Amino acid sequence: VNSFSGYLKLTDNVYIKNADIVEEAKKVKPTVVVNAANVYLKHGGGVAGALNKATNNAMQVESDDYIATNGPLKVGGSCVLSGHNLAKHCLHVVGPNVNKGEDIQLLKSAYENFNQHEVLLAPLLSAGIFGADPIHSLRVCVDTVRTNVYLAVFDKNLYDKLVSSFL
Ligand SMILES: Cc1c[nH]c2ncnc(NCC3(O)CCC3)c12
Numbered sequence: 399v400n401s402f403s404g405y406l407k408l409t410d411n412v413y414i415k416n417a418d419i420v421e422e423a424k425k426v427k428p429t430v431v432v433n434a435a436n437v438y439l440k441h442g443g444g445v446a447g448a449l450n451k452a453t454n455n456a457m458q459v460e461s462d463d464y465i466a467t468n469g470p471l472k473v474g475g476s477c478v479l480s481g482h483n484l485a486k487h488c489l490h491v492v493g494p495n496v497n498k499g500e501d502i503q504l505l506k507s508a509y510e511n512f513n514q515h516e517v518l519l520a521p522l523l524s525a526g527i528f529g530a531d532p533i534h535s536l537r538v539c540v541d542t543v544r545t546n547v548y549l550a551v552f553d554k555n556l557y558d559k560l561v562s563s564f565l
C-alpha cells in the first residue's frame with residue numbers, strides 16, 4: 399500500500415492520473431520523481447522547467463555541478479540526484495527529443511531506467527515538448543516498465559485520449 403490517490407489502474411504495474419506532476423510530488427513526497435531531462439540537465443521548460451522552478455532553482459544548481467564533473471548524459475540514459483523539496487530522489491531520464499531528430503527507438507531504453515526503482519512518479523517520456531506521440535509513449539511504458547509507475551498527465555484532453563485509446 400502506498401499514498402498515491404485517485405489513479406486509474408491500467409495494468410498490473412502501470413497507473414495513470416490527470417495531474418500536475420509538481421503538485422503531485424509535493425503532496426506525496428515519493429521516493430522517486432522522474433524528470434523529463436535532456437543530456438545537459440538544462441531544466442528550461444516542460445516538466446523539467448516546472449520541477450526545477452518548484453525547487454527554487456536548487457535542482458539546476460545541483461545539475462550544473464553534476465555535468466561539470468561527469469559530462470552529459472546519453473539519450474536513453476539517466477542519473478539519480480536529489481529530489482529536493484519534492485521527493486527523496488529525482489531520476490533524471492533522457493528520452494529522445496523528436497524536435498532534435500533523435501531516434502524514437504531510444505524511448506524503450508529510456509523507460510528501462512525505471513526498472514531500477516520499485517515505485518516511481520513519472521511523466522510520459524518524450525511527450526510534450528520532446529515531440530513524440532504520447533499514446534506511443536504510454537504503450538512503450540506499459541511494455542517496458544515492470545516496477546510500479548504512477549504516471550501524471552498534465553493535459554486533461556490528452557489523458558482522456560490516453561485512457562479512451564488504451565488497449
Ligand atoms: C509541463 C508540465 C508541468 N507539470 C507537468 N506534470 C506532468 N506532465 C507534464 N507534461 C508532460 C505530458 O504530461 C504532456 C505530454 C506528456 C507537466
Ligand SMILES: [Cl-]
Pocket residue numbers: 444445525526527528
Ligand atoms: Cl511538456
